[PDB]
């Protein structure tokens, strides 16, 4: 009958539309994987000025959701024995030998526990290998590696970069030529082709100034992916079913489903951040709050890596100046969700949309 499709549309509309209105979001794409089938719901405008509507193929900046792609490349390097998570960072870049990176592991970099690497590179560091090298050579930990989590692009950026070095090829080339094709992603880019620019949404900030992401140090590793809701859901489905990929890539995805420590309700994997499921909306918002992004937290290390599967919610937020993305999936329920918007709107609001959809699907 039509009831299931009507109910799903009613549910997604009811979750999305008030949040779009309340946050003045011009355009938003939702994609849901439910019972092995994709469902797309598209809202509003990709560009207010030219009237292009959002579709499941519209490209959005996903910001730090890119970190989950970076983690997958690292998972490939790891499970191919080109690196180990307990390697010292300077093993993989001679320029760092003699620096504090002699005493910092790849896991620490990946999980933001190297000792106080900041959220962003300073403005003084441009997209330049020598400036990035000198930044790391001069950096000193604020506190002991392995003790506190401080969310950081330079941290997981370096992890990604070193994983590429371990494979003997540039990060960006590996992503284009190996990772994205292995995952079946033809609408996913670090550098959007000229021929696909018509699909690239406009981003909008304060006073609706147009904003698309510019070049920056380790941008590719930290925040550089542009993709469509359909492609991002394909990536969620790969995460739900790594066994559907060839074994080297299956293993790469599995490596991003391992938790190393907890902070509050959140268990930190490579890229993904996990919660028990069900959990309250308020606790999931708290785990995705501004203090979790901006302040250091003492970790509770697990006795061994924990499988992030079963009745757990794995998620990641991503932001750029003009865009706000969120992805969440529940491995034990074969359920995934992507919410891409062309405004950077509060994380709590992204989580509210997702939670309304997930709750409604339960009910
Ligand atoms: B990223 O989008 O993370 C914020 C949303 O969790 C990010 C972090 C640091 C620099 C650029 C992008
Ligand atoms: Cl940065």
DSSP string, 73-137: HHHHHHHTTS--TTSBGGGG-GGGTTSGGGG-BHHHHHTT-SS---SS--TT--S-HHHHHHHHH
The token pair at 149 is 């989590």
Per the CB < 8 A criterion, the answer to whether 121 and 216 are in contact is yes
How close is the Cα of 223 to the center of ligand 2, in Å? 8
Kindly list the domain boundaries of the chain, sorted by start residue: 1-363
Q: Which residues surround ligand 2, an ion (CB under 5 A)?
A: 120-121, 153
Q: Say if ligand 1 is within 6 A of residue 344 CB.
A: no
- State the pairing for strand pair 27-34/335-341: antiparallel
Method: X-ray
The token pair at 337 is 């969700």
The token pair at 322 is 């003009």
Distance of alpha carbon 291 from alpha carbon 281, whole angstroms:
17
Per the CB < 8 A criterion, the answer to whether 339 and 28 are in contact is yes
Q: Say if ligand 1 is within 6 A of residue 324 CB.
A: no
The token pair at 241 is 């079913």
- CATH 3.30.530.20 given to domain 1-363: no
Instruction: Give the residue from 1, 28, 33, 34 showing the smallest Cα distance to 15.
Output: 28
Instruction: Give the residue from 94, 98, 85 showing the smallest Cα distance to 139.
Output: 98
3-state secondary structure of 108: helix
Which resolution in angstroms does this entry have? 1.4
The token pair at 238 is 């790969």
Q: Say if ligand 1 is within 6 A of residue 145 CB.
A: no
Ligand nearest to the CA of 326: 1
């Amino acid at each position: 009958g039509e009831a299931p499709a009507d109910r799903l549309k009613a549910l997604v509309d009811a979750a999305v539309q008030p949040v779009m209105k309340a946050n003045d979001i011009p355009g938003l794409a939702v994609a849901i994987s439910l019972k092995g089938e994709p469902h797309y719901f598209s809202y509003g405008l990709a560009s207010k000025e030219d009237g292009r509507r959002v579709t499941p193929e519209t490209l959005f900046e996903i910001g730090s959701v890119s970190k989950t792609f970076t983690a997958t490349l690292a998972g490939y390097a790891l499970t191919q024995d080109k690196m180990r998570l307990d390697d010292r960072a300077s093993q993989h870049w001679p320029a760092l030998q003699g620096s504090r990176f002699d005493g910092i592991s790849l896991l620490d970099l990946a999980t933001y526990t190297a000792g106080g690497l900041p959220l962003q590179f300073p403005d003084s560091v441009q997209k330049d290998q020598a400036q990035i090298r000198d930044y790391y050579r001069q950096w000193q930990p604020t506190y002991a590696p392995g003790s506190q989590r401080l969310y950081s692009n330079p941290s997981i950026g370096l992890f990604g970069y070193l994983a590429a070095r371990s494979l003997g090829q540039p990060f960006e080339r590996l992503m284009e030529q190996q990772v994205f094709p292995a995952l079946g992603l033809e609408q996913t880019h670090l550098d959007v082709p000229e021929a696909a620019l018509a699909q690239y949404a406009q981003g909008y900030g304060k006073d609706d100034r147009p904003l698309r992401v510019g070049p920056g140090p380790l941008d590719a590793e930290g925040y550089g992916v542009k993709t469509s809701a359909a492609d991002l859901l394909r990536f969620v489905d790969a995460n739900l079913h790594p066994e559907r990929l060839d074994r080297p890539w299956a293993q790469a995805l599995d490596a991003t489903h391992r938790g190393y420590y907890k902070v509050g309700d959140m268990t930190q994997g490579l890229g993904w951040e996990a919660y028990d499921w069900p959990i309250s909306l308020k606790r999931l918002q708290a785990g995705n709050s501004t203090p979790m992004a901006l302040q250091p937290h003492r970790i509770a290390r697990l006795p061994a890596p924990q499988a992030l599967e079963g009745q757990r919610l794995l998620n990641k937020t991503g932001s750029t100046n003009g865009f706000g993305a969120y992805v969440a999936f529940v491995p034990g329920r074969d359920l995934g969700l992507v919410i891409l918007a062309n405004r950077n709107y509060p994380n709590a609001e992204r989580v509210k949309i997702a939670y309304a959809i997930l709750s409604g699907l339960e009910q």
